[PDB]
Amino acid sequence: QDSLSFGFPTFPSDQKNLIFQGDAQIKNNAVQLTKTDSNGNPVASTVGRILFSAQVHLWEKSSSRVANFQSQFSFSLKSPLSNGADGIAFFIAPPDTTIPSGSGGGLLGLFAPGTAQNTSANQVIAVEFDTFYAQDSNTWDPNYPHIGIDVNSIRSVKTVKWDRRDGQSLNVLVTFNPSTRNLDVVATYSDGTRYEVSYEVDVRSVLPEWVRVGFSAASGEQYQTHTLESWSFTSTLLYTA
């Protein structure tokens, strides 16, 4: 299809079009990306991701078209600790993507240790909401919580300082304009606090024509729940000249 869209206002337990990887699962009409105990408390050493089953036609060589897409979603993080880790990320990657070996903790379940910073060894674009930046383990991170755009590397090509609020839902809008090649991110808390970050990227030189979209989250030594509450997505192939 040239166009595709879907919307999950909530996440009822009987899902049919979601690919669950790692510890991801549905609980209380929301997606708990990371593992929790019987009491609903976050645990350490856990990774989880979800992908929509239908593949997205991001670009088409024969027609020289590139898709214009928008992803809207909300999530919340909760943790008895004040150093919650490690973060949640919206990502786009080849359809057969799986959790790389040893991609836990600060690698957010998206990159392999040995090539986490090798841009020519990866095929992924992601928008991370990173809450852990200890310079000893996350050497690639700026020294403060942040939202970043990742293009084939765990070291963001661009970031903006961000504030983690325990238990509060963050509303996010991610848009890609093929005409300008700008990937824009806008995140806001219910009180109006707003954060923005953008970057110009030619998706054609990074990802294949067909991809899958989803979310990933992970907790290493430090932990917190990564609860995905809602999500809607839409993409349309457009002639851009």
Ligand X SMILES: CO[C@H]1O[C@H](CO)[C@@H](O[C@H]2O[C@H](CO)[C@@H](O)[C@H](O)[C@@H]2O)[C@H](O)[C@@H]1O
Residues lying near a second copy in the complex (CB under 8 A)? 1-9, 12, 14, 16-17, 53-55, 57, 60, 62, 95, 209-210, 232
Between 209 and 221, name the residue whose CB sits nearer to a second copy: 209
List contacts with Ca ion (CB under 5 A).
106, 130, 132, 138, 141
Instruction: Give strand ranges (E) for the chain.
Output: 3-8, 18-22, 25-27, 30-32, 46-52, 56-57, 59-60, 65-78, 87-93, 125-130, 146-151, 158-161, 170-177, 182-189, 194-200, 210-219, 225-239
Q: Choosing among ligand X, a second copy, Mn ion, none, which partner's interface includes residue 141 (Cβ < 5 to 8 Å by kind)?
A: Mn ion
Residue 87 CB, nearest approach to ligand X (Å)? 9
d(CA 131, CA 200): 24
Q: Choosing among Mn ion, a second copy, Ca ion, none, which partner's interface includes residue 1 (Cβ < 5 to 8 Å by kind)?
A: a second copy
Beta bridge partners, 66, equal 59, 238
| Interaction of residue 141 with Mn ion, rule CB under 5 A | yes
Residue 10 CB, nearest approach to a second copy (Å)? 8
Between 69 and 111, name the residue whose CB sits nearer to Ca ion: 111
Distances (CA, A) of 137 to 134, 143, 186, 220, 241: 6, 12, 28, 10, 44
List contacts with ligand X (CB under 6 A).
85-86, 104-106, 132, 134, 136-138, 219-222
Residue 9 CB, nearest approach to a second copy (Å)? 5
Q: How many CB atoms lie within 10 A of CB 80?
A: 10
Segment near Mn ion (CB under 5 A); pick from 5-13, 19-27, 92-100, 148-156: 148-156
